[PDB]
Amino acid sequence: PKTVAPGSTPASTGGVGLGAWISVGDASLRTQLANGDGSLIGIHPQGTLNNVLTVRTPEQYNAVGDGIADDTSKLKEMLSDINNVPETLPDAAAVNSYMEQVAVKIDLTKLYRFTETLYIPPGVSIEIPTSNFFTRECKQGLFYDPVDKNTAAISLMVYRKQPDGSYKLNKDVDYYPTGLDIDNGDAITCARKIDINNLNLITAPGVKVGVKWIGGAGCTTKGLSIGENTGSDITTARLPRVGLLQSASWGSIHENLRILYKTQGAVFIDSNGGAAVNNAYISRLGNTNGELEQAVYKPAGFTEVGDVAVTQFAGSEVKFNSPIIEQASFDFVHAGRDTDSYGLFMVDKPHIESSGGKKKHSFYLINTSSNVTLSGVGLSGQDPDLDS
Amino acid sequence: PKTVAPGSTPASTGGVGLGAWISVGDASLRTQLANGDGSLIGIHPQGTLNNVLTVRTPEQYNAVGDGIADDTSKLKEMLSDINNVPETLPDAAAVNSYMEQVAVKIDLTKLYRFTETLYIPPGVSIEIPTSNFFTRECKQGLFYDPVDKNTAAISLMVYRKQPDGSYKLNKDVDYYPTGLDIDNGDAITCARKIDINNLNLITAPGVKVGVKWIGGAGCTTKGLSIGENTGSDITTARLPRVGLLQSASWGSIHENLRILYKTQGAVFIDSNGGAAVNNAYISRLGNTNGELEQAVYKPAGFTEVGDVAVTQFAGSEVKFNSPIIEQASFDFVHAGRDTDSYGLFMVDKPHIESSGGKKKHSFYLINTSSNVTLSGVGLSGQDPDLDS
Ligand SMILES: OC[C@H]1O[C@H](O[C@H]2[C@H](O)[C@@H](O)[C@@H](O)O[C@@H]2CO)[C@H](O)[C@@H](O)[C@@H]1O
Ligand SMILES: OC[C@H]1O[C@H](O[C@H]2[C@H](O)[C@@H](O)[C@@H](O)O[C@@H]2CO)[C@H](O)[C@@H](O)[C@@H]1O
Structure with a gap:
């Protein structure tokens, strides 16, 4: 005989399975199926079925996915x-271990409004059927719509050494x-x-940075698409001031990156050895008042006014x-390393255009060398x- | 108490759910499962489960998928x-609106015979496990087998203005x-x-055009594979006369495109700024009678006979x-724009081969400049x- 004390549950009195509690009847089948894997x-x-279900979706977390409801906590x-x-x-050992975990693929098929910077942990593949x-x-x-606009929509994780030898995740937008x-x-x-395949990221007007691709060595992107062609007034367009900011990402590849921006399309700083950006399509949303934008992340030698x-x-x-590259005041601003002019400006066959022939310079080169093929x-x- | 009138249904008497009608029993469960999501x-x-099922297949529409039955209506x-x-x-607002709908991925795992030109609408991703x-x-x-061979197997959608101011989908094979x-x-x-990944397209012998990549700005392809290596006799092979015809597709990228053709492999016309064709493998199915092929779509300046x-x-x-490029009479035929010679012919490291050393010219250049790296x-x- 099996004695069951008052206040018991199948889970607390042997669990459910062979040799223990076995589900019987239709009510139980319904719950067994509804709460199983x-x-x-x-x-x-x-x-x-469980053997072949490997993708994750915000819907599993009840995200509304309409670009209205705040789906931040669901995404997190x-x-x-x-x-x-x-x-x-x-x-160091502690932060390094988080790069040694199981990687999982995420499929984003609806529109998720979020209001805090999302930090992508290592071991994540994000996909969307097609790129904007x-x-x-x-x-x-993803639609980043925060109260504090002096922030990034999305960011990779980089830990900063504290005075006591401990490490804190960076949350500073400019860092x-x-x-x-x-x-x-x-x-x-x-x-x-x-790995990113076709992630579409839009932003509330005035958001400082779209994507902070920092420390992403060996990380890859294909069809990453930033910004929305909301309308003629770029001032209300749902795109960031700065599309992407990247540093410490050697061996990183961005295939067919698409960026609609207001102030700067993409910025690459410090070590990025061997990184490639192929067939990128970067455009300011029209060039109206383009010449009045002020680059936010730029080398000291670049003091000119105009979008880049x-x-x-x-x-x-x-x-x-x-x-x-389309509709830009400056197609490219490039500075060699201050100390020894290190860092070759490499552009092969750029397709540069601008409505009404409005432009300041295509290659603004400071203390550097370059190989460009027109x-x-x-x-x-x-x-x-x-x-010129 | 709850009174239910004659001829009632759960829907017509309160609906199904908390506070209303609740499904009970095995029979109910079987039907709920069968008709659910x-x-x-x-x-x-x-x-x-419904939260992670996002891909569509033709089997959802009971396509036979054997290459014999006409699966057209089910693909449509x-x-x-x-x-x-x-x-x-x-x-215009009406047609433009269709480019702003939710995109869906389709997985083709069997062989689907169809008999009319398929028009891919915006927001579609197609994948097949491997490329032919x-x-x-x-x-x-996909296997196109029409009654009228003066047609295209697959085409993108471009709307043509009408005298009354309205717009109609183009269905003309040559437009x-x-x-x-x-x-x-x-x-x-x-x-x-x-977005197209590994789509294999074969066609009945005599079909004019395999793929009409028209207006596909920013659209992408990887492993698109056109034509079948049926046998040594090209007149009987399941491949089109003209493999691909592209226009108005600036920023479109074709990665590792594979074409087996009889008359012309791929044709690129008019605005295609910044478009790229990487690691294409284009070959006529042998060069037997290749010299007699007459180019269908070509510039006025090209009047020679031979496949291109x-x-x-x-x-x-x-x-x-x-x-x-293999077994061609003419590897490349390129003409600059009539008015000002615009349109640089750019080919980097072409691997050109032809059986029996049979060939007319590799680079037939008309009113143009070019940069070629051998x-x-x-x-x-x-x-x-x-x-030469
Ligand atoms: O030597 C490193 C770098 O330091 C400064 O760069 C600034 C940059 O000007 C700002 O826009 C922002 O991104 O912060 C950077 C440093 O944290 C110099 O101005 C620059 O020339 C120099 O290369
Ligand atoms: O000015 C554009 C273009 O017009 C003609 O191209 C023809 C082509 O010859 C045909 O094979 C077919 O594709 O229709 C095209 C447009 O009607 C000229 O022959 C060509 O040289 C010219 O560049």
Whole structure:
């Protein structure tokens, strides 16, 4: 005989399974199925449903996915269930271990409004069926809509050494680690095994930075698409002031990156050895008042006023293969490393265009060398004296 | 008490749910499961089955998938359920709106025979597990088998203006929009947010055009594979005369495109700024009678006879990187724009080969400039006077 004390549960009196409690009847089947993992369902050629379910979705966490409801905690919970990285860690060994966990794929098929910077832990693949392209109304992806606009929508994890030898996750928008920081332990990257396929990210007007790709060595992107072609007034367009900011990401590859921006498209700083940006399509949403934008992250030698599609400095040498740059005051601003002019400006066959022939310079090169191959496409601006 | 009138249903007497009607028993469960969406099946770490099922297949529509039965209506239904765009539209706002719908991924794992041109609407991702490569018998993909061979197997959507001011979907096999048409309003593209991975397309012998990549700005492809390596006799092979025809597709990228053709491999016309074709493997199925093939779509300046692997004109300047071209009479035929010679012919390290050393010319250049990098692979024809 089996004695069951008052206040018992099947789980607390032997569990449910062979030799213990066995579910019987329809009510129990309903709950067994509803609270299971799919193991009750057989599949072909053999095995059970759970054996083949590996993707995660915000819907599993009840995200509304309409770009209205605040789905922040749902997205964070989804991320946490994959790899929950505490914001404070004791030492190097502790932060490094979070890059040695199981990686999981996430599929974003609706529109998720969020109001706090999302930090992607290592071991994450994010996918969306297709990439946005001058999309007027974003329907699938992330919509960053915070109270504090002096922030980034998305950011990789980089831990900063504290006075007591402990490490705290960086949450400062303007911060980016240097190759030196990574060498001397002042910063420790917690960004690895991250893959993006078609992530669409829109932003409330005025948000400072779209994506902070910091410390992402070996991390990859394909079809990453930033910004919304909301309307003619860029001042209300749902796109960030700065599309992407990248540092300490050697060996990182961005395939067919798409960026709709207001102030700066993409910025690459310090160590990014061997990193490539292929077939990028970077455009200011029209060039109205473009010449009045003020670059936010720029080398000291660049003091000119005007929007910049691509900015690079502090020894960064990203390879730009066949980029398409549109509607920019400055297509490229590049500075060699202050100390020795290190960092070759490499642009192969750029497709440069701007409505009404409005432009300041295509290649603004400071204390540097370069190898550029022209493809019979380009222009110089309307000022007969200053534009070149 | 609850009174239920004769001829009632649960829906007509309060609905199903808390505070109303609740399903009870095995029979109810069987029907709920059969007619549901997976919501009764829990999965890990939380949520239900419906939350993670996002991919569509033709099997959901009972397609036979054997390459014999005509699965046309079922492929069309699957496409329509994703984005059902009317063949006739009121104005531009109307057609533009269809590029702002939720995108869906389709997985093709069997062989689907169809008999009318398939029009891929915006917001569609297509994937097949692997790409065909000189495949003798196509097992997975699409097989176009029409009564009228003067047609295209697959086409993107471009709307043509009508005398009354309305717009109609183009169904003319030879039509392609120009940059001028798009600028005009004469044409409005409805091809955006389309991604193709490993799509295998074979066609009945005699089919004019395999794929009409028109207006596909920012659309991408990887492993698109056209044509079947049926047998030694090309007149009987399951491949089209013209593999791919592209126009108005600036920023479109074709990665590792594979084409087996009879007349012309790929054709690129008019505005295609910044578009790239990487590691294409284009080959006529042998060169037997290749010299007699007459190019269908080509510039006026080209009047020679012979098959052409790659044809480009009207100001199109697609970048061809590491293409592999085999058994062609003419590897490339390129004409700069009539008015100002615009449109640089760019080919980087082409791997050119032809059986028996049979060939007319590799680079037939008309009213144009070019930058070509040779990789120590190539040859010139057997005519000691004309071939170069
Ligand atoms: O030597 C490193 C780098 O330091 C300064 O860069 C600034 C930059 O000007 C700001 O826009 C922002 O991004 O912070 C950076 C340093 O944290 C110098 O101005 C620059 O020339 C130099 O390369
Ligand atoms: O000015 C554009 C273009 O017009 C003609 O191109 C023809 C082509 O010859 C045909 O094969 C077919 O594709 O229709 C095209 C447009 O009607 C000229 O022959 C060509 O040279 C010219 O660049």
